[PDB]
Each structure stands twice: as structure tokens, then as C-alpha cells.
Design a binder for this molecule. Structure first.
Ligand SMILES: Nc1ncnc2c1ncn2[C@@H]1O[C@H](COP(=O)(O)OP(=O)(O)OP(=O)(O)O)[C@@H](O)[C@H]1O
Ligand SMILES: Nc1ncnc2c1ncn2[C@@H]1O[C@H](COP(=O)(O)OP(=O)(O)OP(=O)(O)O)[C@@H](O)[C@H]1O
Ligand SMILES: Nc1ncnc2c1ncn2[C@@H]1O[C@H](COP(=O)(O)OP(=O)(O)OP(=O)(O)O)[C@@H](O)[C@H]1O
Ligand SMILES: O=C(O)CCC(=O)C(=O)O
Ligand SMILES: O=C(O)CCC(=O)C(=O)O
Ligand SMILES: O=C(O)CCC(=O)C(=O)O
Ligand SMILES: [Mg+2]
Ligand SMILES: [Mg+2]
Ligand SMILES: [Mg+2]
Lengths: 109, 109, 109
């Protein structure tokens, strides 16, 4: 099992949720976060002066899936979150050793 | 070392904190998140019409513990967070390779 | 690749960001969280009476880096976040198996 961790543009959350749902991936954890990547935020022109915003509002989407489902989950997120501009997002894959459903106590290892 | 990541009902946080404390597990990180599981949220009846809420407020509890302590931490969370209804929570176990205490610089590997 | 996860005092975020930037580590994810460590929060005296605050506001800094860069990232965070008092923070290192840039689709494994 793996956890797919995507940090996307907040306005792309609905697109991502729908692309994952259509593929049968419904379970996910969503966190409001802030971040920046390799461009260290954005430079804007305001009243003829350059202004820097080095930390932007982002949405973190965490999806725990089977090892074989990772590539598909990554493809679903890329296809629905992509705009072609800096800041589209990063996806990180982290190993998950155990998964427990609290209600039933069932544990997948 | 492992990180035990529990996503629980927000109203169960105090129960979970107390169950972990009684067992000597005090250190934890708590994040307000949103999510859904296999039932894709909830269906409610409002003014004679069916309404869907597909992302619910949840509380993420992260507890870094020794490898041998995992099962106990998982049991403590299940016993205190469980209601017997859909949405009680999921628990994921993730490997932690290093743990550093900033104040002292001590690092456990 | 590894994810360096630091839980620091909120007032140290700017120091940490600058120390990481000076070393060329710009990409990071920042989350507002709450937590406590081994001292189980703080005890304050208010109106001649002892009061306990068992969960404090903290800032989680997540930095995905190459395996060889971990130690430096940990040193940068320790040097800029340290005050010498309980609550300076914890740093956890978690393995990252894949990293994808959404815009380009490039994947580092
Ligand atoms: N090395 C990193 N460690 C942790 N989080 C990161 C890292 N890089 C980026 N992120 C997170 O991913 C979000 C999206 O990053 P972004 O899409 O700008 O990545 P990028 O590498 O700069 O690619 P691009 O050139 O397409 O912008 C960031 O705002 C931050 O929350
Ligand atoms: N596959 C998953 N990936 C990431 N987070 C998940 C996943 N499944 C559930 N979660 C998180 O766990 C929270 C609790 O999920 P929930 O208890 O409903 O799980 P479940 O598998 O549907 O079990 P149940 O049938 O008892 O409801 C969700 O709201 C979401 O934040
Ligand atoms: N075992 C743990 N599991 C998960 N998060 C933890 C753990 N211990 C501490 N944290 C997080 O790290 C933050 C900082 O912890 P803190 O610096 O107080 O650690 P400590 O072990 O008590 O060291 P110190 O004695 O210097 O205070 C906490 O508020 C919490 O968010
Ligand atoms: O995140 C954005 O929307 C633009 C900024 C960016 O790409 C970055 O900081 O790397
Ligand atoms: O989370 C809940 O409280 C009910 C919804 C649920 O179980 C789910 O979406 O899987
Ligand atoms: O976090 C603090 O600022 C003081 C409390 C502390 O160190 C703890 O709970 O372990
Ligand atoms: Mg970028
Ligand atoms: Mg459910
Ligand atoms: Mg402490």
C-alpha cells in the first residue's frame, strides 16, 4: 500500500476529486496548506512596483491505495490538476505498512 | 520508529488523547482536515429532498512511536474513537527513519 | 528521496524558510497544526492558580529532498528553529519513493 500525496491549486480540487471518483478512488484526506516550489512563489506588479508572494495557498490531497493502483492515481491527478503553468503541483508517494478501519478493526498489511 | 496516522471524528479527539496519555503516549501532532471514505460522504434528507455532503470535517492525529509500540497505539485509538457507525476512521502506519529533538539535537535512527 | 517533516514554533517559520533558502532549499509545504510533546503542553499561573494548556499551536514544515541532502536540511532547521527551551520542535524523516512535477509530468524515482 502507498500514500499518494498531491499538493495542487485549490481551484483544481473538484476536478481532482471527480477524476479519482470516476476511476473508483473515493477515499481521500484533504488539507488546506501553504507552499512554494522551485520558483519561490510569485512576482506581481502592483502600482508600478514589483511585489513578491513567497508562500501560496495550496490544497494537499492524500490518497492511500494498493501498490498496483499508484500509477493510475498519479495519472488521474496529473490529467485533472494540470494547467501548463508553474505551480500545477507536486506528487509524492510514501510507503504505508498498515491500514486499519476503526469501525470493524480490520487491518490490511 | 513509525508514524501512526489516524483520521478520526473531531468529537473523539479528547477520548483519543486521554486513551493515549493513560498508556504514556503524550507526544502527537493534530491537524484539522476534511475527507471521505468508501461511502463517499453522507446523504441527508432536508425539506423532503436528498442532499449529499461528500467531504466531512475530520481530525488527523499523528503519533511517532517505537516499532514495538505500534500495535498498542493502534488499539488505544480504535478503542477510544470507535462508535460502530461508518466514518469512525482510518489508521495508516508509515515508516520514520530519523527522529530529532531540536532543543538538544539528539537524533534517534 | 526523503521527506523532512519539522514541527516548529510558529514564530520561527520565517527563520527556517530563510535558512533553507540560503542553502538552496526553496520547495516546501507548510501546515498550521496543534501538538504537544514529552512535557504534555504547558502549565501557566493565572490569577494565583495553575492552568494547563495541553495542545499548542505549531507549524509543520515538510521538505522533500535527495537522500544525501537530509542531514543538511535537518541542520538548517535545528540551527534556525532552536531557542534552548522545551517545545523547540521535532524533526521526522520519512521515505519518498516517487516525486512527480504535475506541469511536465516528469517523475523522479
Ligand atoms: N521539495 C518540496 N518539498 C515539499 N513540498 C514541495 C516541494 N516542492 C513543491 N512543494 C509543494 O508543492 C506545491 C506545488 O509546487 P510546484 O507545482 O510549484 O512545484 P515545482 O517543482 O516548482 O514545479 P513547477 O515548475 O511546475 O512549478 C508547493 O506550493 C508546495 O506546497
Ligand atoms: N483511501 C483513503 N486514503 C486517504 N484517506 C482516507 C482514505 N479512506 C478514508 N480516509 C480518511 O479517513 C477518514 C475516515 O474514513 P472512514 O472511517 O469513513 O473509512 P471507511 O474505509 O469508509 O470505513 P467505514 O466503512 O467504517 O466508514 C476519511 O474521512 C478520510 O479523511
Ligand atoms: N511522538 C510525537 N509524535 C508526533 N508529533 C510529535 C511527537 N512529539 C512531539 N511532536 C510534535 O512536535 C511538536 C514539538 O514537540 P517538542 O519540541 O515539545 O518535543 P519534545 O520531545 O517534548 O522535546 P522538548 O523536550 O525539547 O520539548 C509538538 O508540539 C507536536 O506537534
Ligand atoms: O504556485 C504557484 O501557483 C506559482 C509559484 C510556483 O510555481 C512556485 O513557487 O514554485
Ligand atoms: O465520515 C462520516 O462520518 C460518514 C461518511 C463515511 O463513512 C465515508 O465517507 O466513508
Ligand atoms: O511546545 C511548547 O512550546 C512547550 C510544550 C512542550 O515542550 C511539550 O508539550 O512537549
Ligand atoms: Mg513551481
Ligand atoms: Mg466510511
Ligand atoms: Mg516538549
Amino acid at each position: 500500500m502507498k500514500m499518494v500525496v498531491a499538493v495542487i491549486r485549490p481551484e483544481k480540487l473538484e476536478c481532482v476529486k471527480k477524476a479519482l471518483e470516476e476511476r473508483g478512488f473515493v477515499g481521500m484526506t484533504v488539507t488546506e496548506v501553504k507552499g512554494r516550489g522551485e520558483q519561490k512563489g510569485i512576482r506581481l506588479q502592483f502600482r508600478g512596483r514589483e511585489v513578491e508572494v513567497d508562500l501560496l495557498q495550496k490544497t494537499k490531497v492524500e490518497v492511500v491505495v494498493s501498490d498496483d493502483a499508484v500509477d493510475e492515481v498519479v495519472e488521474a491527478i496529473v490529467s485533472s490538476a494540470r494547467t501548463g503553468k508553474f505551480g500545477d503541483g507536486r506528487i509524492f508517494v510514501i510507503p504505508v505498512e498498515k491500514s486499519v478501519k476503526i469501525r470493524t478493526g480490520d487491518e490490511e498489511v
